[PDB]
Amino acid sequence: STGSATTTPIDSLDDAYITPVQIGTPAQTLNLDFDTGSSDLWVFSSETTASEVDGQTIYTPSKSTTAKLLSGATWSISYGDGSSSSGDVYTDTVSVGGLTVTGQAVESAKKVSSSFTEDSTIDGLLGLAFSTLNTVSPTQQKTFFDNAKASLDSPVFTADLGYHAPGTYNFGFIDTTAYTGSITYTAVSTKQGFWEWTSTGYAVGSGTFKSTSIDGIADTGTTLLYLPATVVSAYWAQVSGAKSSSSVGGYVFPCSATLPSFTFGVGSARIVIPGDYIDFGPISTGSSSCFGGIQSSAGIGINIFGDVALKAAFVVFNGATTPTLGFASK
């Protein structure tokens, strides 16, 4: 089997991407944030505290003939941005882009933190990291990809995120029309439950490439590119007037600037992030200070190849017995 679904930016900045997912019988379609940095499929629901729902579409298990309470199971998750959610668990039929999993754990939120409530466009998350990070207790549950894997034509999914445009998540096949050149594959460590890999270096603009190993995670659920402070300083030093602002929470730059590109290495290959992808717009409405899309990972404890980086590439998440990642230009 295969599946193919379009993923759409939630706003004009590509702050996140939403993909429609069918849950239950008859189908209830919710727009979920596919997140290769976590491993829980959780939704706003008829169980979510009413004051914490503000415009989201909810899953109502009592209206699904295939829903079943997973008795005794609870979940609770906290994300790197400080947001969180928790609740109980049902199993139900879940379909993405024509690919159907029966018996998928659907984690129903009883509580969500303010950032989730305040984002009316995201109805939940669909985790695509390794199932060892799933938070369901006392019986850990498998991700949608893990459950689908055996049925897929090939044990892979791909992320093809758009810049200010829709893109695609494919399951079970690699669309050879969706990228240019060849795909370069690179080793993955699953020791922390992430799609963790080692970039071979970077360049700023037209500058020379610096060969240096940068361990980090491929994380579709993180907006920005978070890299070591040395690398990030070297980037922003090429932008007149850019500075790190403790009050804003990272590097800002004059909105009048033209940003240089940023290249990262994948083995001997190179992925180029155009400068425009690094512009996250005014820090507040009407400000002439703009927020940068490359930020320091110092204090986060891991480097994160988030959407800013991934959207410049066609990315293969290869879930074979020994997982690997593939990157191609597009």
Half-sphere exposure of residue 123: CA atoms within 13 angstroms, side-chain side: 20
Give the separation between CA 207 and CA 142, rounded to whole angstroms: 44
User: Which of the residues 35, 119, 123, 219 is marked catalytic?
Assistant: 35
Q: Where in the chain is the domain with CATH 2.40.70.10?
A: 5-174, 175-330
What residues are paired with 20 via a beta bridge? 31
Fold of 175-330: Cathepsin D, subunit A; domain 1 (2.40.70)
* Chain discontinuities in the chain, listed by preceding residue (C to N exceeding 2.5 Å): none
Does residue 199 have an active-site annotation? Answer: yes
**What technique solved it?**
X-ray
Q: Is 160 a catalytic residue?
A: no
Q: Would you say domain 5-174 falls under CATH 3.40.50.12280?
A: no
Neighbouring residues of 221: CB distance < 8 A, sequence distance ≥ 6: 16, 33, 34, 35, 36, 37, 38, 79, 125, 306
Resolution of the structure, angstroms: 1.2
Question: Considering 199, 261, 296, 297, which one is annotated as catalytic?
Answer: 199
- Alpha-carbon distance of 216 to 79, in angstroms, equals 17
CB 313 within 8 A of CB 274: no
